[PDB]
Amino acid sequence: SRLNDELLGKVVSVVSATERTEWYPALVISPSCNDDITVKKDQCLVRSFIDSKFYSIARKDIKEVDILNLPESELSTKPGLQKASIFLKTRVVPDNWKMDISEILPEEELDPEERDNFLQQLYKFMEDRGTPINKPPVLGYKDLNLFKLFRLVYHQGGCDNIDSGAVWKQIYMDLGIPILNSAASYNVKTAYRKYLYGFEEYCRSANIQFRTVHHHEPKV
């Protein structure tokens, strides 16, 4: 856990639990993204590039703190390791960390592709963590625009930087919900904590960023 902090966001090589000679590539992420797994000292929370699942691992199972300089023969028959190498170099999130946009189910979003990317990653993350999104989330008796909420909270400094119910009330208004009662502030805070806070912690510690939220590519 101080070990977790030292290795945060690294793509690492993990000894397999079922075969002491095999290994798998994994991404070190914040324990704050998963409430259902506990992480002690000299343990790390990782997400597997093989099965997309989360595991708490001890220092003895960290074969390498990186996947650098591996031989071409190693990658030739290891699609998980190819995907992990792409993640390290260019931050392309693997397909198996994404849910199909159809299994989840653009006029206002400036980057509707990035919005879909965001949603596919959030839904797969939520499933793999064990808090899957079964019903379309709702806020103010209307489907919740998850990407927009994420953006609004980011521009306020992230969930943990929000110190006022009045900030949350204005986020609720900035979502375009037309009727505000006295519970609006508490309702959007609670909805954020339920659907997005874990994903915020995960993406930040994973070094995953979205266009039109974290950065801008005007000439793309």
Describe it for me?
This protein is α+β, with helices and mostly antiparallel strands and about 220 residues long. The protein has a domain at about 1-95: SH3 type barrels (Roll), CATH 2.30.30.140. Helices cover about 40% and strands about 10% of the residues. The protein has a five-stranded antiparallel β-sheet. α7 packs across α8. The longest helix is centred in the middle third of the chain and has 18 residues, at about 110-130. It starts with a helix and ends in a 14-residue tail after the last helix. It is found in: Nucleus. This is AT-rich interactive domain-containing protein 4A. Identified in mSin3A corepressor complexes together with SIN3A, SIN3B, RBBP4, RBBP7, SAP30, BRMS1, HDAC1 and HDAC2. Interacts with BRMS1. Interacts with RB1. Interacts with ARID4B. Interacts with AR.
